[PDB]
Write a protein that binds this ligand. Structure first.
Ligand SMILES: Nc1nc(-c2ccccc2)nc2[nH]nc(Nc3ccc(C(F)(F)F)cc3)c12
Ligand SMILES: Nc1nc(-c2ccccc2)nc2[nH]nc(Nc3ccc(C(F)(F)F)cc3)c12
Lengths: 230, 40, 273, 252, 230, 57, 40, 216, 58, 40
């Protein structure tokens, strides 16, 4: 018959080698597909949905308290919160971006943060939300934070602010795993003014933090997560 | 070229499709526009 | 080519894309250009790598069985002697795969199986032998083998494959679900009764796969492990859901530990970097 | 000015009027509808109770106070005892529904707090005993009385809202159709859900579709005064009820 | 020659792998095919033929008695017979649908029952034949049976009644093996009136039960039966 | 595509498809629509899996 | 593509055929119609 | 052209409960690099920026340096473990399920072959890096800071079989569709370590000498 | 199926044998190539550049 | 013929290109000509 030559790799098993194969059930007729709502085509359709960030993951915060960021009266210029911007082992670890990014090695594109105020309708505050690009430290003072990318958020009828964190990397892709070379920098929030509640009242009010991907979001090279312990 | 006439035997062929995140990101009766109040 | 961003200069408008309400349950498709000044640039990305097909359509180990080739002992059931072994079909035995499937409520796909066998002789052997391994489908209602070589193994109507140790089997199985999609979860029971199994297990009537060494005993005891890998093809899925944070305990069940570890790394202060 | 904050819902012979509401949600972007000939597999002329069933039903309210963990209702189970719908559920061998789910919670400008309202399909529950223990029928089908996550049990499902009731984290429950109720902004949430299943029609007694979670994220507080107590009321209606097959009344 | 790569599955033997192969008898000329009556193309052509159901398979009924359903005089509202509707291990186990269905895993579509009266030409009765959809229990009383799908059968010149049991499942396919999740419900028959024979006579009369598939009958995924013991 | 069933409403006719005689040895091709009210629906099945060729081959 | 010229070597090719149950379900000289008396 | 990149040794033995499985060589982890073996490194060093797709070939050979009764053909698994992926701890823990991690199985005496597309973050792989991971006085210097390629894990998937079997797995690499920019002088002195361009304190001048400028 | 005959060299590994092979990363999308100065096509483009000769290597 | 649809799988195909040594041999702003003074 036709002369052939076998090449290296003959009879190997390869996890990702898409090939044809014989059917075990030669004339089987599959069950018809009825219309089902919520069809998913791409993981990046999911990455764009907002989920909560456990920003208050401090010790002694067992329960839903991890998703509540406290604000207090008469405090000004102080830091509300801050964190190192990882999509791996940071505060974003358990968010959907976290969970999706843990299945990929390379991350690129813009992130979206969003905060929602849940205090009294009669209360008010202005908050500064800022992003500090790679190479910088801290910030430790508002005077430093204000030099990065930032938004000043006025509490009012519209209860949610959206901060789109631009892609500022000089490297086309960054790692999902923590890696000094591709650090994404920091996120922080400061009291622009102060929290003001009605006269003679004293309360702590909270914000809820959210995260989602921007349309310009890229993921490459799939890998197993570290969320499985057996 | 397909070598088997039983369709399950076909390799993982397919096209990429345009994404449609609106099903998960904007499932609202009344259309919201960027820049418009969310709370009218 | 799709743009990632378009040039945008300073604004001073009454239109405010940065201010909204998550109360509505909607996530508006805002961009960096709605917050800061930007420069026109391309994506150079199609997103093909993140398609559902690639996420799920990779081989994964599903189950491992152990069968042996030994002189049969008349005092014990052949199955107990591991002369043959029955694997009830499921994809929930090994978490690395289960976890991905758990991210969708309804999943539809064709399957590809790969079966790989490896022998071992942990004894005072004189020689090694390459055994022939038989794998057979036993769908619900089909007879279950009782002896290592009873009539059941004739495979008159049951799809089956023979392969040698060191070699592998490969075949496709079309979507076998009764419904239009496989359910990953089932919030219900087999019937209206106070006492009955709860959850997806009640829908799992996939049947079993039986494994056997088809050779006769050969003086020494040979152990064969058969590893079954699965890959989904032509994959569709509906209704995405949150991934599980806590450890799995059992197959089908969503149970978790009485006092689970909170799967959120903690820190000293809300402002600690 | 037809403000988006004001809505009227008319369904059957009942109405809902709101003045402080967020845009309603249509789950997965698909409005509820009847089974097509293409999808259908059951060869019986179907029954369409129409407006005799597709109307609003109100479930007993529950008090939301500091320390509350949240509540869970199952559909269609919650409505099994209400109106003709509840009766039809036990005479028809199979059926399909869509829902309009409306959650209400009043407060003044001096109140703070936040509820998360989520509709989760196929919310298979973890048992309080863990291990190989299944949750018994009796504890997944409570009817109008939802599963109060604030109540102790040892035979029921796990009640800790951080992990919902199935091991996922609440933070990611927002993937499901959901809406928030911030007492400072809105007192209602409305979600419209199409029939979602792997089959055209199914049992309405041995299987639930939808699990309605109402979990407080931020406790109710007030600028002054003692711990507040705010009732939470849930109103639910079938959208396009379609039933098939007649049998003697099912006995549970 | 042509470079090639072997893939997993090389040299496997697979029961259902339809491929070409060399002939052992290179120029053999097969015997001509004469016309033979009764050609079969599909098993579903067989499924549509009526066979008897051993409904009276009670203990102490050895012989053809299993195919005879007794009816008695002066009985009213009582049950004539009833059974759980399996195509696996029920009374239908040994019928042709039984035997054919035992070679398949998945069953769907409508079933047809038929009953034939074999009593005196001068006798009469009305019988209620009913089907009780899944999820119901019993029935134990006629009042329950009448709420399902039913037909009232008048005994007369035409000796046979046909009851087509509609597909009522909410699941596209049901199992041939008994399985609670896909129970098909129950079949029962009750005396609508009573059996009446000529004056001053006392006899037991019988019916013969039959079963066949409706044109809308589907079978999928072949398997071995449990009818072979060696 | 082949229909499994066609819409059929309540009847009150002298035509009686539910009543026959097995005595003849014939099995008439009656349908669910000849007994109960029905709704139009497709089979989505060709019967290819049950061909003699698959049974024996 | 067939590789052998001895027809037995051909793979199990074939078409599906319309079913004809009338050979087994209605083998009667006089045609019976649904709805008509079986016993005239 | 194919070149050997790295060799690992794994064994098939009854596990010992007193030692980490990795230390027993029940499995082995190769951190991906092309700098381990000089014959290849030297060529890549001649360009500053290099871009290519890769082709891998993995060849395994067994040996039984003991009182064996028979030989066995073992099945070898190779698995990619990109950054962030779990690292195997036991010779047969869940990690090896390879649910999402590309992997290949092959027998001793046979070989694996597969392609891997350009995986660089940047538009090209850097052969050199005159810098640090970040602005700090103390931090690693040079190309090592960019090497987050991940690791490849090797395992014998068979159970112990009475005797200890040693398997060496040799990994070969070939570049395809190769582009390169900014050529540079080749290294004259011996290499000491991976990534680093360090050389001996008192290197031998790599220029053969002669008695006179006019000696032929 | 198609009759085949294997020839000598089957399953050999050869350093310079350029052939196709399965991808380990089926839908991966490579990082875009930005313009980089100094592209090299051929070693003979390098051979033409003057370098110093250690003629006084005594 | 390519057998795989993932481009990395392609064999080492390519053309030979004309050499362009001027990038390395004559990187000067002002063009030098053979026979002309290098130092004007
Ligand atoms: N068996 C099932 N049936 C149903 C279901 C039944 C009726 C109505 C709706 C859904 N849903 C399921 N979800 N997961 C199932 N188990 C499973 C599925 C495929 C395979 C494998 F490996 F064969 F593909 C192995 C195990 C499963
Ligand atoms: N990992 C690397 N990253 C970068 C880099 C990162 C960010 C910006 C710019 C450059 N440059 C590199 N140069 N050599 C590297 N190591 C290497 C590359 C490929 C392979 C193999 F074998 F996988 F192809 C094995 C090892 C390397």
């Amino acid at each position: 018959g036709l002369p052939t030559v076998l090449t290296p790799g003959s009879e190997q098993f390869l996890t990702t080698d898409d090939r044809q194969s014989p059917s075990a059930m030669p004339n089987y007729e599959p069950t018809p597909l009825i219309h089902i709502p919520g069809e998913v085509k791409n993981l990046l359709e999911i990455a764009q949905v907002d989920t909560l960030i456990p920003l208050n993951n401090t010790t002694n915060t067992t329960g839903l308290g991890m998703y509540r960021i406290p604000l207090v009266q008469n405090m000004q210029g102080e830091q509300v919160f801050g964190f190192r911007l990882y999509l791996g082992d940071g505060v974003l670890k358990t968010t959907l971006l976290g969970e999706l990014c843990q299945y990929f090695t390379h991350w690129a594109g813009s992130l979206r943060l969003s905060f929602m105020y849940t205090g009294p309708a009669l209360s008010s505050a202005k908050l500064l939300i800022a992003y500090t690009p790679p190479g910088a430290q801290g910030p430790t003072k508002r005077k430093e934070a204000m030099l990065g990318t930032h938004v000043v958020w006025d509490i009012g009828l519209q209860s949610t602010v959206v901060l789109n964190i631009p892609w500022t990397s000089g490297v086309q892709y960054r790692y999902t795993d923590p890696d000094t070379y591709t650090s994404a920098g920091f996120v922080s929030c400061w009291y622009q003014t102060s929290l003001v509640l009605p006269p003679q009242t004293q309360q702590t009010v909270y914000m809820l933090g959210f995260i989602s991907a921007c349309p310009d979001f890229k993921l490459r090279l799939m890998k197993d997560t570290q969320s499985i312990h057996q | 070229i397909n070598y088997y006439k039983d369709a399950a035997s076909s390799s993982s062929a397919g096209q990429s499709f345009s994404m449609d995140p609106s099903k998960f990101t904007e499932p609202v009766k009344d259309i919201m526009l960027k820049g418009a109040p969310a709370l009218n | 080519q799709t743009l990632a961003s378009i040039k945008s200069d300073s604004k001073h408008t009454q239109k405010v894309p940065s201010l909204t309400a998550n109360e509505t349950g909607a996530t508006l498709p805002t961009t960096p250009s709605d917050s800061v000044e930007t420069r026109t640039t391309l994506m150079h990305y199609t997103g093909s790598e993140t398609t559902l097909e690639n996420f799920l359509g990779r081989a994964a180990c599903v189950h491992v069985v152990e069968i042996v080739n030994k002189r049969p002992t008349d005092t014990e059931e052949h199955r107990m002697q591991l002369l043959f072994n029955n694997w009830k079909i499921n994809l929930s035995s090994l978490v690395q795969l289960r976890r991905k499937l758990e991210m969708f409520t309804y999943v539809r796909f064709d399957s590809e199986y790969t079966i790989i066998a490896t022998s071992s002789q942990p004894n005072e052997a004189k020689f090694s032998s390459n055994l022939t391994i038989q794998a057979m489908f036993i769908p619900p209602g089909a007879p279950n083998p009782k002896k290592w070589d009873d009539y059941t193994w004739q495979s008159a109507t049951n799809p089956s494959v023979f392969f040698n140790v060191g070699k592998s089997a490969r075949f496709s199985v079309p979507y076998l679900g009764i419904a239009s999609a496989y359910n990953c979860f089932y919030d219900g029971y087999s019937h209206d009764n106070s006492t009955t199994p709860y959850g997806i297990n009640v829908l799992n009537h996939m049947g079993s796969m039986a494994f056997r060494v088809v050779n006769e005993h050969d003086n020494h005891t040979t152990h064969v492990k058969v590893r079954v890998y699965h890959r989904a093809k032509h994959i569709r899925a509906w209704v995405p859901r949150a991934p599980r944070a806590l450890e799995y305990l059992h197959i089908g069940r969503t149970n978790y530990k009485q006092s689970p570890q909170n799967p959120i790394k903690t820190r000293k202060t809300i402002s600690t970097y | 000015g037809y403000s988006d904050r004001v809505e009227q819902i008319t369904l059957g012979n009942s109405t809902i009027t709101t003045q402080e509401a967020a845009n309603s949600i249509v789950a997965y972007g698909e409005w509820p509808s009847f089974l097509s000939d293409v999808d259908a597999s059951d060869v019986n002329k179907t029954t369409k109770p129409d407006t005799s069933a597709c109307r609003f039903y109100t479930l007993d309210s529950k008090m939301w106070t500091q320390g509350s963990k949240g509540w869970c209702w199952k559909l269609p189970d919650a409505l099994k005892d209400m109106g003709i719908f509840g009766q039809n559920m036990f005479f028809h061998s199979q059926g399909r529904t869509g829902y309009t789910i409306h959650v209400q919670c009043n407060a003044t400008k001096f109140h703070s707090g936040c509820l998360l309202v989520v509709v989760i399909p196929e919310h298979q529950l973890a048992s309080a005993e863990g291990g190989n223990v299944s949750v018994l029928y009796d504890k997944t089908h409570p009817g109008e009385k939802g599963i109060d996550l604030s109540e102790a049990d040892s035979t029921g499902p796990m009640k800790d809202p951080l992990y919902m009731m199935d091991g996922t984290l609440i933070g990611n429950s927002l993937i499901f159709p959901h809406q928030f109720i911030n007492l400072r902004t809105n007192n209602t949430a409305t979600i419209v859900v199409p029939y979602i299943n792997s089959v055209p029609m199914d049992s309405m007694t041995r299987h639930n579709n939808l699990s309605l979670m109402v979990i407080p994220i931020v406790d109710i507080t007030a600028t002054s005064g003692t711990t507040p107590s705010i009732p939470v009321t849930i109103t639910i209606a079938p959208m396009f009820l379609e039933l098939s097959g007649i049998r003697s009344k099912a006995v549970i």
